[PDB]
Curated annotation (Swiss-Prot), chain A:
Organism for this UniProt entry: Escherichia coli (strain K12)
Family to which this protein belongs: Belongs to the bacterial ribosomal protein bS21 family.
Membrane-crossing segments per the record: none
Gene label: rpsU
Protein name: Small ribosomal subunit protein bS21
One GO MF term attached to the UniProt entry: rRNA binding
Full protein stretch here: 4 to 54 of 71
UniProtKB/Swiss-Prot annotation, chain B:
Gene name as annotated: rplA
Single Gene Ontology BP annotation: ribosomal large subunit assembly
Record organism: Escherichia coli (strain K12)
Family named by the database record: Belongs to the universal ribosomal protein uL1 family.
N6-succinyllysine sites (modified residues): K104, K153, K185, K196
Name the UniProt record assigns to this protein: Large ribosomal subunit protein uL1
Keyword rRNA-binding tagged: yes
Pfam families reported for this sequence: Ribosomal_L1 (PF00687)
InterPro entries: Ribosom_uL1_bac-type, Ribosomal_uL1, Ribosomal_uL1-like, Ribosomal_uL1/biogenesis, Ribosomal_uL1_3-a/b-sand, Ribosomal_uL1_CS
Keywords: Repressor, Ribonucleoprotein, Ribosomal protein, RNA-binding, rRNA-binding, Translation regulation, tRNA-binding
Molecular function (Gene Ontology), one example: structural constituent of ribosome
Keyword Repressor: yes
Swiss-Prot record, chain C:
Full-protein residues shown: 3 to 152 of 179
Gene Ontology cellular component annotations, sorted alphabetically: cytoplasm; cytosol; cytosolic small ribosomal subunit; membrane; ribosome
Keywords (A to Z) from UniProt: Ribonucleoprotein, Ribosomal protein, RNA-binding, rRNA-binding, tRNA-binding
Family, similarity comment: Belongs to the universal ribosomal protein uS7 family.
Protein name according to UniProt: Small ribosomal subunit protein uS7
From Swiss-Prot, chain D:
Assembly with partners or alone: Part of the 30S ribosomal subunit. Interacts with proteins uS7 and bS18. Cross-links to IF-3. In stalled ribosomes contacts ribosome rescue factor SmrB.
GO cellular component: cytoplasm; cytosol; cytosolic small ribosomal subunit
Name of the featured protein: Small ribosomal subunit protein uS11
Gene3D superfamilies found in the cross-reference section: Ribosomal protein S11 (3.30.420.80)
High-level lineage: Bacteria, Pseudomonadati, Pseudomonadota, Gammaproteobacteria, Enterobacterales
Entry function: Located on the platform of the 30S subunit, it bridges several disparate RNA helices of the 16S rRNA. Forms part of the Shine-Dalgarno cleft in the 70S ribosome.
Length: 51, 223, 150, 117
RNA sequence: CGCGGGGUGGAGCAGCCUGGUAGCUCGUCGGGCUCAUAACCCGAAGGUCGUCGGUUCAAAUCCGGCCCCCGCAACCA
RNA sequence: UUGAGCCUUGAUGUGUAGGAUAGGUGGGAGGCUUUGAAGUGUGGACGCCAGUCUGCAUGGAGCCGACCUUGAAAUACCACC
């Protein structure tokens, strides 16, 4: 995870709720070097039903 | 140094390096006293003779005009008329089986204990309570004998008892600093000639390595 | 694993209203008779006033407020290997652990009257010497040289 | 020497060791401690206890320098990070400058399932 | 020609300054373990801690002698 | 900068058990403290966790053996090593 956040924490991190297995987070979208591309999709949003 | 006021005022009379002749200092020994208890002059001898081997261990006692610096209260364990002979010679308490209960329970008002050989059957049961006090009689050093009247008198007349310590050293008192300094040169020879007759059987060549003499927490004297 | 269990806190003693005396007669219960234990513990004060026991407010409190156990010993696994590790004593056996250390020390002693062996064991806890009080100290002295694991 | 009331620090924790070092901004050594200096070995040398005791051994090396605030750097993933930072208060320190100095050294990846636990 | 240490079930070693007190490894007779065999672990059986003096309520032990061992050792005509 | 050595200074002693860190060894009851401890607490330090040293709030000549108990054996106050 490689984080630099310091001071007011306990219990040796893993602070994000539902981060691995059966979602969250990512692997939606696991193949072809696109692993971190759904974070970009849900930030460039705008609508999700597009024509 | 760093020294206490009681002794700092005595350095106002005496030199820190000089050891004084016992034939010349005869008015000075009484003059360097400062304590709230009685100060003495004591002899320190270096040995030997072998510094480890217990076959060359030195033990004994010697008679002196003032003994240990006081008179002693002597007790005698003896049955029948021979006890009255020790009571008239130097004993202040006569002992029997009735007294062996008190000594074992813890109470004893005497400096020396003497016994006769047929009375020593009782005293043999006190060897572990009289042991750690040096108070137990033993035939092998003469403190058990039929002539108990002369043995209580030997203690009451004033004697000092000794034995050498670790690595071969021995220390004994030879007078109070207030007592006649003229006699120190006389009584020292009576102590030395008697300690020199106490040489071990397997002693060879030499016996004394060094002699020193000093006052309680005070200056040294020369011979 | 699962469970999550129901637990019991037991009935108080029918003379004094004390549940601490009730747990003491339960640890003193042998052969299931249970009335026998009432006649052994708190059945005399004249036998505690025979030794070190001073006034009735201390005739049972010498097994309660006189001590505080904290840890137990034995080994525990950490990763791929086992180590000697002091473990945290649970907060309701905390006040009822020394009851076994007193009842065992009296029961296994060869000195006749059991009602008197127990009053003598309470007297030897009122001086804070040897039995039960050193069974607290021995494991605390161990845990003062064993701290890396819990 | 003399009172300075200033210094800099380094605190590291891994899954095999933990250490504490205090120095000056002119490069002078002021105090050091390690879990091996605390006398620990093997699977016990990375514990959060081994880190919290080493923190006070370094606070005893700097004791005459007058230091209450020092500029800290933090290294390594190990749980000794959390107890060595709490031990700054048991050392008498109150901080205003602290940064993570751990090498990244590349992008990502794959957070583990062991250590913790 | 001398000195230090040693004498303990079947072989080789403890020690000291807890004197109220025989410890051990190795083997042997048996288990754990094992598909056995190796590696590691621990029950059981058997001896006067030599020997003559000594202190003592008491020494295999300490203090004196002896003897056999194990290591070091020196000189006048 | 330090090897060896000598004075000065300061403290050594907890086999083991509890009230208790009984050094050796010989004495011995009135001897020592007035920035001086007691005693419960926020603190510092060595630790064999018993003890001791220092600081502050304080209170200000005690305290101790003998008594009472523990043990073959003592436990204020002290030479000597």
């Amino acid at each position: 995870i490689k984080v630099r956040e310091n001071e007011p924490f306990d219990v040796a991190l893993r602070r994000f709720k539902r981060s691995c297995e059966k979602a969250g987070v990512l692997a939606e979208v696991r193949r072809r070097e696109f692993y971190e591309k759904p974070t970009t999709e849900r930030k460039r949003a705008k609508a999700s039903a597009v024509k | 140094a760093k020294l206490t006021k009681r002794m700092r005022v005595i350095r106002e009379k005496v030199d820190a390096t000089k050891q004084y002749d016992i034939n010349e200092a005869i008015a000075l020994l009484k003059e360097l006293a400062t304590a709230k208890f009685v100060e003495s002059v004591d002899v320190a001898v270096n040995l030997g003779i072998d510094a480890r081997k217990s076959d060359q261990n030195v033990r004994g006692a010697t008679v002196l005009p003032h003994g240990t610096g006081r008179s002693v209260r002597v007790a005698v364990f003896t049955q029948g008329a021979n006890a009255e002979a020790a009571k008239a010679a130097g004993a202040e308490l006569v002992g029997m089986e009735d007294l062996a209960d008190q000594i074992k329970k813890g109470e004893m008002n005497f400096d020396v204990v003497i016994a006769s050989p047929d009375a020593m059957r009782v005293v043999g049961q006190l060897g572990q309570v009289l042991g750690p006090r040096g108070l137990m009689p033993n035939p092998k050093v003469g403190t058990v004998t039929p002539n108990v009247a002369e043995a209580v008198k030997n203690a009451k007349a004033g004697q000092v008892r000794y034995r050498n310590d670790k690595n071969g050293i021995i220390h004994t008192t030879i007078g109070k600093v207030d007592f006649d300094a003229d006699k120190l040169k006389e009584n020292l020879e009576a102590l030395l000639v008697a300690l020199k007759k106490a040489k071990p059987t397997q002693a060879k060549g030499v016996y004394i390595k060094k002699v020193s003499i000093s006052t309680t927490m005070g200056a040294g004297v020369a011979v | 694993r699962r469970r999550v269990i129901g637990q019991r806190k037991i009935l108080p003693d029918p003379k004094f209203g004390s549940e601490l005396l009730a747990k003491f007669v339960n640890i003193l219960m042998v052969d299931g008779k249970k009335s026998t234990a009432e006649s052994i513990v708190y059945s005399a004060l004249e036998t505690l006033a025979q030794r070190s026991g001073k006034s009735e407010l201390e005739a049972f409190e010498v097994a309660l407020e006189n001590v505080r156990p904290t840890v137990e010993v034995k080994s525990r696994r950490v990763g791929g290997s086992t180590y000697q590790v002091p473990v945290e004593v649970r907060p309701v056996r905390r006040n009822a652990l020394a009851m076994r250390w007193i009842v065992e020390a009296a029961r296994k002693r060869g000195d006749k009257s059991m009602a008197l062996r127990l009053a003598n064991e309470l007297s030897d806890a009122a001086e804070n010497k040897g039995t039960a009080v050193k069974k607290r100290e021995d494991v605390h002295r161990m845990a003062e040289a064993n701290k890396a694991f819990a | 020497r003399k009172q300075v009331s200033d210094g800099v620090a380094h605190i590291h924790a891994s899954f095999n060791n933990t250490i504490v070092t205090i120095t000056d901004r002119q490069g002078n050594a002021l105090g050091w401690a390690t879990a091996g200096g605390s006398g620990f070995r093997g699977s016990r040398k990375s514990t959060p206890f081994a880190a919290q005791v080493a923190a006070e051994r370094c606070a005893d090396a700097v004791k005459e320098y007058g230091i209450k605030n020092l500029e800290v750097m933090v290294k390594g993933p190990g749980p000794g990070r959390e107890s060595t930072i709490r031990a700054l208060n048991a050392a008498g320190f109150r901080i205003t400058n602290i940064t993570d100095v751990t090498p990244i050294p590349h992008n990502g990846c794959r957070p583990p399932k062991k250590r913790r636990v």
